[PDB]
Design a protein around this ligand. Structure first.
Ligand code: CLA
Ligand code: CLA
Ligand code: CLA
Ligand code: CLA
Ligand code: CLA
Ligand code: CLA
Ligand code: CLA
Ligand code: CLA
Ligand SMILES: CCCCCCCCCCCCCCCC(=O)OC[C@H](COP(=O)(O)OC[C@@H](O)CO)OC(=O)CCCCCCCCCCCCCCC
Ligand SMILES: CCCCCCCCCCCCO[C@H]1O[C@H](CO)[C@@H](O[C@H]2O[C@H](CO)[C@@H](O)[C@H](O)[C@H]2O)[C@H](O)[C@H]1O
Ligand SMILES: CC1=C(C/C=C(\C)CCC[C@H](C)CCC[C@H](C)CCCC(C)C)C(=O)c2ccccc2C1=O
Lengths: 124, 165, 742, 73, 144, 40, 80
């Protein structure tokens, strides 16, 4: 069969993945979308603020960077939505279905924008 | 003169060009000894440079505003004004040699086609035959024309393979 | 316990010219003679492919052994010519008197068709082509002081060349070693470690201690070369040597009584560069070769041959067995004693990597007198030995794939290191694939980021020392550690090994020989370009080796062979799947990667190291513009290629005008090659059909049927012309530039 | 100076015409591929057999001729 | 001769495994199974890379595409003089048998086979492309 | 000796001698008649 | 699926069948040649278009011809 390896087949690694929102079955797709969106949205603000074109402005740097992070989350939400449209047109987990993914994309937008807003509040 | 050109012997720019080249050689000369090996070589170069500029002027070439010789290719203009040696005469000089080489090679190729194994006569040259054909090629224009008139120069259309059409 | 012994066969082959008159005799396919022009190319392509002519390993080994004598004989003719031309057509004797003002020259051209202008004014009342091979510096270091000494070496070189060709004939036609002889790897390593490298190093130490050191000590003192004692007078008269080095007054007793400190006067550990000549101390170099001699002589007593003591290489390999690697190194010993290609793959890899290491160490630690201040020699030697290393490494991939197709046998390799590597090749190539993509974005993307920010008028947004900074902190730490090594970690060394680490510059004849090299943002960016282009070359070559036998596209690629064009247009198209084609593609990337290496070296040296010393300070050739300009692609185009190519394009009418011609001609050959790379033989075979018709019409059609080159030969002809044109273009550009200004 | 450049232009026109004209007159077939018409204007190749047939279609003759057109212009 | 029936419980060679094996296609579209009898335990080369030991008696392997199965078949027949046969297996559980289609390898002529895609003319007797134009789809003159 | 003279008759050997001769003739002519541009 | 056609110049050498790496071709009885057998292409849905069969055919011009056509998972030679 496939080449066995500790990275591919280890107990500690398997348990960690099984607890991630993507693999945690039994949770509504919308809730998983919010949990995933919040984590990525919070991180997405970092690089824009520190290395953006308006990084050296004292107060505008925080606003401009976070506002660009919010924009990228919006674009990503569109990518999630159209992916579901193309992939699911006609199985065990509700997420991998036309109904499930549409809820998942909506949750990501709500969670992602909340994370970007929450990141801004931390700064000011 | 022809096409607005002027004889190099009467060209101001042509004369100035010779001084520039000789001046460059003279400048390098004065950093050596009188009869050292480098000095002798440089003096020899200067002699050839002076001879070259005299020969081209003596040949009656035409120089442009650049002061460099230009050649006349039209046979009528060349023979009219004595420029036959630039392009016209060398034209028939080359064709004789070019036809010589081509005719000799064609004679050898026909000669070995009659042999049992022509391919082995091409990688491994039959030197005695090649030398024989090399000397007889001096009369190629006569032999070439006689083949044309007797109709043995070209293959028949029916003996040449062609693709579907 | 097969004894190690000499074993030969008497008169294996007859010496006759019969087969000289039968081309293709070596191969069954070509022995029948030509029918199409394809036969001619096949004759030269397969001439040295011994492994395919016969299946007998013994016959293959005997041809390899004698073909190596022919290579040695050719090098001796080449070496003899270099020494001879130094004696008869050089200004070496004048150069010894005034090394800092006279340009080395050892080639003279005849006065024909006006080519005598290439005999430039080089100094010493001599006219000739300036050489960048560094032979004058090598001869001075060894102690050569007259053209007679050069002449005798050339005559000895020809005698050695004759001996090498006799040996090849003797050991193939008269006394050919048997296969069991060639397979004494333990014995060969013992002799090559202690005998070739070991005694060779000791013998050269003898020359340096007795000839080079005394002669160069007086030359540096200013003594006229003609008034220096001859090397044999130094050898016969211990009184003379005692004057230069008092340690010689005690003879060899200190060596045998272990009072080795007595020899401190000529066996030194100074470090740094000799201030008078700008090269390494020869007393340091002598102690180096004495130390290296002992290390290798000890190394040559490690393997067991006939007297029990020693190691068995098979036993070492089989003992190194771990939990993560299955069987381990089992089976490698049989692979490496029955496959010449496997041996060649290893040796080319390390021999090429060594040639690249030589280039870095020789420029940073100039080992010859007056080598450093001769910028043309420094640039040429570094660039020459980088190119040699590059080609050898690509060959290592080529002959690793040949082993994989021809000499690999699954029965002998089951669950060993070799087998397990093949069983996760997708994991290796997929990860190496991602690393290359990552390195391409984060190294070349930075240049694109800088070029766009600069064009937009946003210099503060660029990656540079005056903007967002990328400091090689790790490299800077190492430079400082080596600079302070003599204080605490190498107490008995007087100076740092190189002046690149730090300290003060050494200037010879008003020119900088070596000075500290600073690493900044531009150096950070260029280095990660090197890592990118090297990693990609590994990807291409390693992919070819791992997928030589099969892939998910061609499950039976081994049966097709090592060198085939494709498996047809099916499966979407399978052009260039063979392992030979991975060498073909790998050559382009090796050329791409080494071109940046030699551009990096050329610009960095001129900008930051090379220059003229004056009262105010050091003025460099390009005035320190590397730091601010080499962070954009536009900077390289304008400041490096466009500005420095001024010398080559203005060369006409001077002694350097030859480089101008080759600069254009190289551009031509390179573009000519794209005809073979961008086309396919289908077009050309149809074109020849119409051309053949004209010859048939005139009864002048050849008996050997014209054929368009094969698919593989089109790719081989393309890459050879592409490399020659590209490399020759840089070669002309470098020499015309550095000779003109350097 | 104009003499040399004009003759280089003629080389460009004649060579580009050669490639394009061959691509058209040989489009329907050739000795190496007598029945090329049955495959169409644009196909990859006929495989490595018969010595190799890379760039044998009439589409490929046009493809090679574009290079010479750019060079000429 | 009758069509063999595949036995899913057939033992497989001694192989550690590799990364060149089946992918997600096998679980969604199809995969291929090759079976044969081995006279003695021997080492052979896997078309996916590596070496495997064939058990004495029946052996069974699974491959991702047909060409991989027929590549192993060539190795077993030419070197080991064996007579392997392989199937096409679908995710729904259906099994399709092929090679040898009728029990005799195609290289050997056998009565009962019906010629397919045979044109009783030469290549040079095909019609011109103009005569098969506007036939509803791109059609070569050879098809008609 | 027959085989050796056969080897000298091979295409690469003949071409080397022939072009060595041809080149030498052209070089020698330009040595005694330097800079020929017009027949004159 | 590609198109594979056998023409009446076949001499029944069987080389095309041996060359095929996907068992697309087979030999069938015939009376039009000395060998009394002809090549057949019953399983063209498995053809990948390698043209190894055309490489192996001795007749001039070829007696087996492959016309690349519509692509699919099988004809594109994919294992994924
Ligand atoms: C490649 C083509 C070509 C071209 C464009 C020219 C062009 C020219 N030729 Mg040349 N010529 C050529 C080939 C060519 N020639 C060849 C192959 C030969 C035979 C070896 C000659 C022999 C020749 C002679 C003998 C003369 C010219 C002359 C001329 C000039 C005017 C007449 C002429 O030829 O008109 C255009 C050209 C053509 C239509 C092609 C055929 C030209 C024939 C062969 C010559 C015509 C001469 C003409 C009747 C002279 C009348 C007197 C004149 C002062 C008006 C003109 C510069 C005349 C001259 O020197 O004028 C100053 C002249 O006397 N040519
Ligand atoms: C370093 C260069 C080199 C060396 C050492 C060899 C060595 C060899 N070549 Mg190779 N060869 C080379 C370069 C080289 N070749 C090149 C560049 C080409 C062109 C692609 C060829 C083309 C070639 C062919 C076509 C053949 C060889 C053959 C041989 C073998 C016999 C030669 C012999 O008896 O010479 C004797 C040498 C002398 C007596 C020296 C004096 C006379 C010479 C001509 C000066 C030998 C293994 C022959 C062979 O049998 O290969 C298996 C053979 O048929 N070579
Ligand atoms: C790597 C080997 C090598 C190379 C590339 C050259 C290259 C050259 N040599 Mg040198 N030479 C060499 C080895 C070499 N030599 C050796 C080993 C010897 C000792 C016998 C000589 C002895 C020698 C002499 C005596 C002369 C040269 C000369 C020449 C030049 C003209 C050669 C020529 O056209 O001859 C003619 C061509 C044919 C016979 C064919 C040329 C730059 C000549 C030179 O530089 O003159 C200024 C010259 O006089 N060489
Ligand atoms: C005059 C002496 C002599 C003679 C008559 C023979 C005769 C023979 N040898 Mg022997 N041989 C000799 C000397 C001789 N050998 C020497 C000196 C060596 C040591 C290198 C060898 C090594 C040797 C080997 C290893 C083999 C032979 C073989 C042969 C046979 C065929 C050789 C052939 O086809 O050569 C024709 C080949 C050439 C003329 C090429 C010459 C290559 C040399 C090395 C010059 C290289 C120049 C180099 C490329 C220059 C750069 C090129 C660039 C400027 C373009 C034949 C029985 C072969 C054999 O028996 O096969 C069954 C065989 O495998 N010989
Ligand atoms: C391989 C390297 C090498 C060689 C060949 C030499 C050689 C020499 N060294 Mg040097 N040396 C070396 C390395 C070397 N050295 C190193 C690495 C060091 C650093 C430790 C030194 C340090 C050093 C010192 C300090 C001195 C020498 C000296 C000498 C000379 C005399 C040695 C002596 O007393 O020998 C004693 C005896 C022998 C070596 C045996 C000789 C055996 C002969 C050749 C046998 C001949 C037999 C034959 C059948 C007879 C001919 C018959 C025929 C005519 C018919 C000698 C020229 C001495 C000298 O004079 O310097 C100027 C000296 O003082 N060396
Ligand atoms: C120690 C070095 C070494 C040795 C001993 C060999 C030996 C061999 N190699 Mg390997 N190889 C090496 C290095 C080496 N290789 C390197 C560095 C590379 C990377 C470029 C390769 C890449 C390589 C490939 C890709 C192949 C081989 C093959 C072979 C085998 C046949 C070679 C042959 O017939 O050549 C005959 C020689 C020629 C046809 C002459 C080539 C001339 C070149 C292209 C000229 C280039 C320009 C010139 C140097 C300078 C300008 C010339 C001027 C006239 C303009 C043989 C076992 C072949 C094989 O089948 O192996 C099993 C094969 O396919 N090698
Ligand atoms: C300048 C010419 C050029 C370029 C840009 C590339 C680029 C590449 N080659 Mg190629 N290659 C070239 C010439 C070139 N090659 C030539 C002439 C040959 C023939 C010898 C090859 C042969 C060859 C081989 C055989 C291989 C490559 C590989 C690669 C890849 C290296 C790793 C990577 O992904 O880097 C990152 C990509 C880049 C640096 C490209 C430029 C990226 C820009 C600057 C930034 C991105 C733009 C941004 C998103 C904005 C887009 C906006 C737009 C959408 C509106 C990469 C795609 C290797 C590969 O695939 O490795 C995985 C590989 O195996 N090449
Ligand atoms: C289209 C190509 C072309 C043409 C037409 C010429 C023509 C000429 N070149 Mg040039 N040249 C060319 C390409 C060309 N070159 C190239 C590619 C290069 C680079 C390698 C050079 C480099 C070059 C140089 C360095 C020199 C020339 C020179 C010459 C002249 C030689 C005359 C001579 O040798 O008479 C000799 C006389 C003969 C009769 C020779 C033929 C002998 C046979 C046996 C006659 C038989 C008759 C029946 C001539 C004007 C020389 C000159 O002075 O030009 C002004 C000169 O020094 N050429
Ligand atoms: C580093 C990894 C060392 C790994 C190391 O030393 O492992 C050590 C381990 C050796 O295990 P054994 O003790 O069983 O080996 C016995 C040996 O004698 C060999 O038979 O090797 C492996 O497991 C091989 C596969 C490693 C797979 C490594 C994957 C990561 C590669 C990263 C490459 C980075 C390159 C950076 C260059 C500067
Ligand atoms: C492997 C071993 C190879 C060894 C090769 C040795 C070659 C030696 C050649 C030189 C011969 O000379 C070597 O011995 C001479 C005789 O003792 C020494 O001669 C010295 O001592 C003599 C003692 O009477 C004096 O007369 C000499 O004037 C004095 O120079 C040389 O200083 C030494 O260099
Ligand atoms: C130009 C070209 C050709 C045509 C090139 C050919 C046929 C090679 C020509 C070599 C020389 C010029 C011909 C043989 C010369 C003889 C040795 C005779 C010479 C006699 C004297 C003049 C020396 C291909 O065959 C080809 C194949 C595959 C991909 C690309 C291409 C490609 O681009």
């Amino acid at each position: 069969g496939m080449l066995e390896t500790p990275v591919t087949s280890a107990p500690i690694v398997a348990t960690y993945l099984s607890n991630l929102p993507a693999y945690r079955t039994g949770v509504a797709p919308v809730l998983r979308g919010v949990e995933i969106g919040l984590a990525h949205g919070f991180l997405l603000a970092g690089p824009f603020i520190k290395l953006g074109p308006l990084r050296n402005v004292p107060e505008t740097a925080e606003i401009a960077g976070s506002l660009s992070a919010a924009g990228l989350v919006l674009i990503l939400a569109l990518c999630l939505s159209i992916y579901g449209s193309a992939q699911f047109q006609s199985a065990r987990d509700p997420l991998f279905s036309a109904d499930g993914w549409s809820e998942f994309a909506a949750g990501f937008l709500v969670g992602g924008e909340a994370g970007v807003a929450w990141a801004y509040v931390c700064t000011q | 003169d022809i096409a607005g050109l002027t004889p190099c012997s009467e060209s101001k720019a042509y004369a100035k060009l010779e001084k520039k080249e000789l001046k460059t050689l003279e400048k390098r000369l004065k950093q050596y000894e009188a009869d050292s090996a480098p000095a002798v070589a440089l003096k020899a170069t200067m002699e050839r440079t002076k001879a070259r500029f005299a020969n081209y002027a003596k040949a009656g070439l035409l120089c442009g505003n650049d002061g460099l010789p230009h050649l006349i290719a039209d046979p009528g203009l060349a023979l009219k004004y004595g420029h036959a040696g630039e392009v016209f005469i060398p034209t028939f000089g080359f064709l004789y040699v070019a036809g010589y080489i081509g005719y000799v090679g064609r004679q050898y190729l026909i000669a070995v086609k009659g042999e049992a194994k022509p391919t082995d006569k091409e990688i491994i040259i039959d030197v005695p035959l090649a030398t024989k054909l090399a000397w007889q090629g001096a009369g190629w224009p006569l032999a070439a024309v006689q083949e044309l008139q007797r109709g043995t120069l070209l293959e028949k259309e029916e003996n040449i393979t062609v693709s579907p059409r | 316990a097969k004894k190690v012994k000499i074993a030969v066969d008497r008169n294996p082959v007859e010496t006759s010219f019969e087969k000289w008159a039968k081309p293709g005799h070596f191969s069954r396919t070509l022995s029948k003679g030509p029918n199409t022009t394809t036969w001619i190319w096949n004759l030269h392509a397969d001439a040295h492919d011994f492994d395919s002519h016969t299946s007998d390993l013994e016959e293959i080994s005997r041809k390899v052994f004698s073909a190596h004598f022919g290579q040695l004989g050719i090098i001796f003719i080449w070496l003899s010519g270099m020494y001879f031309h130094g004696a008869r057509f050089s200004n070496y004797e004048a150069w010894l008197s005034d090394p800092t003002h006279i340009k080395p020259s050892a080639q003279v051209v005849w006065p024909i068709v006006g080519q005598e202008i290439l005999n430039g004014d080089v100094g010493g009342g001599f006219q000739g082509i300036q050489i960048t091979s560094g032979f004058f510096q090598l001869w001075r270091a060894s102690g050569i002081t007259s053209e007679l000494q050069l002449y005798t070496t050339a005559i000895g070189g020809l005698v050695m060349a004759a001996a090498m060709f006799f040996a090849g004939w003797f050991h193939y036609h008269k006394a050919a070693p048997k296969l069991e002889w060639f397979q004494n790897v333990e014995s060969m390593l013992n002799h090559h470690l202690g005998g070739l490298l070991g005694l060779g190093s000791l013998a050269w130490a003898g020359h340096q201690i007795h000839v080079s050191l005394p002669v160069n000590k007086l030359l540096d003192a200013g003594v006229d070369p003609k008034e220096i004692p001859l090397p044999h007078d130094l050898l016969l008269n211990r009184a003379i040597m005692a004057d230069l080095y008092p340690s010689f007054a005690k003879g060899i007793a200190p060596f045998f009584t272990l009072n080795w400190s007595e020899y401190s006067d000529f066996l030194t550990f100074k470090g740094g560069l000799n201030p008078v000549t700008g090269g390494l101390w020869l007393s340091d170099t002598a102690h180096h070769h004495v130390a290296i001699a002992v290390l290798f002589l000890v190394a040559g007593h490690m393997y067991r041959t006939n007297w029990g003591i020693g190691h068995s290489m098979k036993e070492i390999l089989e003992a190194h067995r771990g939990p993560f690697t299955g069987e381990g190194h089992v089976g490698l010993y049989e692979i490496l004693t029955t496959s010449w290609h496997a041996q060649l793959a290893i040796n080319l890899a390390l021999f090429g990597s060594l040639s690249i290491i030589v280039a870095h160490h020789m420029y940073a630690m100039p080992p010859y007198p007056y080598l450093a201040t001769d910028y043309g020699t420094q640039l040429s030697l570094f660039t020459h030995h980088t190119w040699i290393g590059g080609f050898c490494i690509v060959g290592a991939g080529a002959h690793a794939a040949i082993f994989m197709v021809r000499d690999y046998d699954p029965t002998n390799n089951y669950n060993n290191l070799l087998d397990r590597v093949i069983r996760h090749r997708d994991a290796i190539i997929s990860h190496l694939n991602w690393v290359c993509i990552f390195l391409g974005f984060h190294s070349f993307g930075l240049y694109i980021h800088n070029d766009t920010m600069s064009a937009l008028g946003r210099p503060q947004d660029m990656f540079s020392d005056t903007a967002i900074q990328l400091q090689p902190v790790f490299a800077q730490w190492i430079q400082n550690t080596h600079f302070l090594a003599p204080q605490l970690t190498a107490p008995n060394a007087l100076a740092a090994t190189s002046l690149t680490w730090g300290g003060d510059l050494v200037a010879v004849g008003g020119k900088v020989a070596m000075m500290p090299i600073s690493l900044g943002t531009s150096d950070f960016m260029v280095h990660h370009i090197h890592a990118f282009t090297i990693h990609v070359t590994v990807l291409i070559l390693l992919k070819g080796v791992l997928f030589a036998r099969s892939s998910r596209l061609i499950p039976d690629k081994a049966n097709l062979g090592f060198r085939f064009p494709c498996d047809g247009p099916g499966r979407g198209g399978t052009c260039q799947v063979s392992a030979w084609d991975h060498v073909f593609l790998g050559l382009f990337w090796m050329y791409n990667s080494l071109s940046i290496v030699i551009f990096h070296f050329s610009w960095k040296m001129q900008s930051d190291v090379w220059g003229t010393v004056t009262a105010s300070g050091v003025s460099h050739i390009t005035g320190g513009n590397f730091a601010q300009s080499a962070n954009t692609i536009n900077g390289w185009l304008r400041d490096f290629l466009w500005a420095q190519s001024s010398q080559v394009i203005q060369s006409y009418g001077s002694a350097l005008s030859a480089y101008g011609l080759i600069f254009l001609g190289a551009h031509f050959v390179w573009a000519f090659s794209l005809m073979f790379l961008f086309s396919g033989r289908g077009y050309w075979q149809e074109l020849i059909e119409s051309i053949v018709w004209a010859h048939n019409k005139l009864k002048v059609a050849p008996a050997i049927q014209p054929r368009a080159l094969s698919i593989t030969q089109g790719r081989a002809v393309g890459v050879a012309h592409y490399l020659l044109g590209g490399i020759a273009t840089t070669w002309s550009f470098f020499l015309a530039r550095i000779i003109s200004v350097g | 100076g104009d003499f040399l450049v004009h003759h280089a232009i003629a080389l460009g026109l004649h060579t580009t015409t050669l490639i394009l004209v061959k691509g058209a007159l040989d489009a329907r077939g050739s000795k190496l591929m007598p029945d090329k018409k049955d495959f169409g204007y644009s196909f990859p190749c006929d495989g490595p057999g018969r010595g190799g047939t890379c760039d044998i279609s009439a589409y490929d003759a046009f493809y090679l001729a574009v290079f010479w057109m750019l060079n000429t212009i | 001769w009758t069509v063999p029936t595949l036995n899913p419980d057939t033992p497989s060679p001694i192989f550690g495994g590799s990364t060149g094996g089946l992918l997600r296609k096998a679980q969604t579209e199809e995969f291929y199974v090759i079976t044969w009898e081995a006279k003695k335990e021997q080492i052979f080369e896997m078309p996916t890379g590596g070496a495997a030991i064939m058990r004495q008696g029946p052996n069974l392997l699974k491959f991702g595409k047909k060409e991989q199965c027929l590549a192993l078949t060539t190795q077993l027949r030419n070197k080991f003089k064996l007579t392997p046969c392989f199937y096409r297996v679908f995710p729904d559980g259906k099994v399709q048998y092929l090679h040898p289609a009728d029990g005799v390898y195609p290289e050997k002529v056998n009565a009962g086979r019906v010629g397919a895609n045979q044109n009783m003319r030469r290549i040079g007797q095909n019609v011109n492309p103009i005569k098969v134009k506007f036939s509803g789809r791109m059609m070569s003159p050879a098809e008609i | 000796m027959k085989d050796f003279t056969t080897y000298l008759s091979t295409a690469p050997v003949i071409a080397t001698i022939w072009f060595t001769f041809t080149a030498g003739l052209l070089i020698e002519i330009n040595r005694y008649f330097p800079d020929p541009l017009v027949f004159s | 699926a590609h198109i594979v056609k056998i023409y009446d110049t076949c001499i029944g050498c069987t080389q095309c069948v041996r060359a095929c790496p996907l068992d697309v071709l087979e030999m069938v009885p015939w009376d039009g040649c000395k060998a009394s057998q002809m090549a057949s292409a019953p399983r063209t849905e498995d053809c990948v278009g390698c043209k190894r069969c055309e490489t192996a055919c001795p007749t001039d011009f070829l007696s087996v011809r492959v016309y690349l056509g519509s692509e699919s998972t099988r004809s594109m030679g994919l294992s994924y």
